Amino acid sequence: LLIRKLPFQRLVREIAQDFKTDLRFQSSAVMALQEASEAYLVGLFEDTNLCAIHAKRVTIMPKDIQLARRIRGERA
Amino acid sequence: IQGITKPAIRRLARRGGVKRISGLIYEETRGVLKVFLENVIRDAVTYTEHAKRKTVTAMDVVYALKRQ
């Protein structure tokens, strides 16, 4: 993995608390969560970057991300 | 909160193939990363409430993933 372990656990925890108030997570279940989030974000960036490329650019802009999301189906 | 450190991001982006990054990608990546979790756990819980189970196993995530 590539995200730091501790600061990821805390985030999952805040959201998890939010829905539902009674809430408990397994140890590997959070591990599985992290490994997904990275895979996804790398998945995402490869797309994002190739919209940077499409624009004949090198630096990626949010506009690139946003496109890559509109085209898949991600809201917002 | 958003302790998703900027150089964490760069590691991934670069893993993606990214070669240069606008400064606003950080806030953006953060925003999406949240949303991804926000509604991948939202939908995992539901696979665990519907086995009337205490806590959420990895397995029920993998299930909540496949919907995505």
Partner: peptide, 22 residues
Amino acid sequence: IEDEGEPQEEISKHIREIFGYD
């Protein structure tokens, strides 16, 4: 038959696969 293999115990390899990842 020697045609069944052997493990490593990592399930993550499936998530890597859900999104496509080295």
